[PDB]
Amino acid sequence: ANFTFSPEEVARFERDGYIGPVKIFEPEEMTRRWNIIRRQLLDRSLAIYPDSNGKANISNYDRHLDIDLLAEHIMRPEIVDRVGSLIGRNLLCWRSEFFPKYQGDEGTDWHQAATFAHATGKPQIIWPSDRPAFIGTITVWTAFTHSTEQNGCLQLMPGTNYDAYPMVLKPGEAVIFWSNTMHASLPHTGSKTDYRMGFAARYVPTQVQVYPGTENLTEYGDGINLEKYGAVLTSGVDEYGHNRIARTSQRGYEFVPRQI
Ligand SMILES: O=C(O)CCC(=O)C(=O)O
Ligand SMILES: O=C(O)CCC(=O)C(=O)O
Ligand SMILES: [Fe+2]
């Protein structure tokens, strides 16, 4: 079993800043899992972040650190072998978050997101640098429900300032892109019972510093509390040790690095 990208695939990712759809799970399997996960999300008894109104809580950040199925999701070979083909075999999953969309939600115009924390503007991800430090993170956006044009799917732009495709996904399919890739989104114009649920997991090679400058902090903002936070070594080895790391989830799920 190997899901590394071909030189071709890797090439078009380099060209577009994204690649998708890529199958992670069969639609029925994804749905089966999401049926469990959806209910488990409700129990926060072991969630690493406390009750708050910050987006870390409201958008359920890093539940892969306490929900078994999410813990397994970020470890999946279908995800890891692919991301590894892009930024290396020594991979860290430093975050996961949910992206729901409901009837009436508006779309967004063309833009690119930054990895700075909203509450403080502090950079969350810092790459090694000679002066400006790169701050991007490969994001794996998995459709837990279908992502359609009708329910507000994302929009990606081919090629890379200058030199409108809808990324529709079936449950279990994912789109992989740099967190700062140019994108937009359509408004949700479907029925009120048709919600879209995307689960995003973000990865950075081991040499990247996650949550820099927080050595003596816990309360970080936006509901994020680093006390029980740790990045997960998804594959390879960590020759750095400069990041908070979680070898095990709050429920005892052991994260055994995959040797692509
Ligand atoms: O969900 C949406 O409607 C837009 C999402 C978006 O623009 C983003 O995640 O960068
Ligand atoms: O994950 C990202 O790309 C940005 C995250 C962010 O801005 C935040 O958590 O406040
Ligand atoms: Fe966006």
Per-domain residue ranges for the chain?
Answer: 1-260
Give the atom of ligand 1 at the shortest distance from the alpha carbon of 105.
3
Q: What's the DSSP call for residue 245?
A: B
Q: How far is CA 1 from the centre of its chain?
A: 23
Q: Which of 100, 155, 114, 137 is nearest to 234 (CA)?
A: 137
CA 181 / ligand 1 centre spacing (Å):
12
Q: Which of 209, 201, 218, 215 is nearest to 241 (CA)?
A: 209
Pocket perturbation via mutation, ligand 2, pick of 95, 99, 116, 134 by most ligand atoms within 8 A of CB: 116
Q: Which of 123, 126, 138, 133 is nearest to 181 (CA)?
A: 138
**Amino acid found at 163:** D
- Close Cβ partners of 189 (under 8 Å, ≥ 6 residues apart): 103, 150, 151, 152
Q: What are phi and psi of 43, to 5 degrees?
A: -90, 115
Q: Which of 194, 197, 198, 208 is nearest to 239 (CA)?
A: 208
Give the atom of ligand 2 at the shortest distance from the alpha carbon of 117.
10
Tokens of 138: 């490969």
Instruction: Report the alpha-carbon distance of residue 46 to residue 192 in Å, rounded.
Output: 31
Q: How far is CA 133 from the centre of its chain?
A: 21
Helices 77-87 and 7-16, axial angle in degrees (round to 10) = 70
Instruction: Report the alpha-carbon distance of residue 49 to residue 62 in Å, rounded.
Output: 8
Q: What are phi and psi of 133, to 5 degrees?
A: -90, 130
Tokens of 186: 């359509």
Tell me the CATH architecture of domain 1-260. Answer: Sandwich (2.60)
Helix/strand number for the chain, H first, E second: 5, 14
> Is there an atom of ligand 1 within 6 Å of 41 CB?
no
CA 158 / ligand 1 centre spacing (Å):
17
Which residues are 258's β-sheet partners?
235
Q: What is the resolution of this structure in A?
A: 2.2
* Least distant ligand from the CA of 147: 1
Instruction: Report the alpha-carbon distance of residue 41 to residue 74 in Å, rounded.
Output: 16
Tokens of 42: 């409700």
Alpha carbon nearest to ligand 2 atom 7, residue: 117
Other C-beta atoms closer than 10 Å to the C-beta of 158 total 12
Q: Which of 70, 62, 61, 65 is nearest to 39 (CA)?
A: 70
Q: What technique was this entry resolved by?
A: X-ray
CA 183 / ligand 3 centre spacing (Å):
6
CA 257 / ligand 1 centre spacing (Å):
31
What Rg do the C-alpha atoms of the chain give, in angstroms?
17
Output helix, strand, coil percentages for the chain, rounded to the nearest 5: 20, 30, 50
Which residues are 205's β-sheet partners?
91
CA 6 / ligand 2 centre spacing (Å):
30
Pocket perturbation via mutation, ligand 1, pick of 108, 141, 144 by most ligand atoms within 8 A of CB: 108
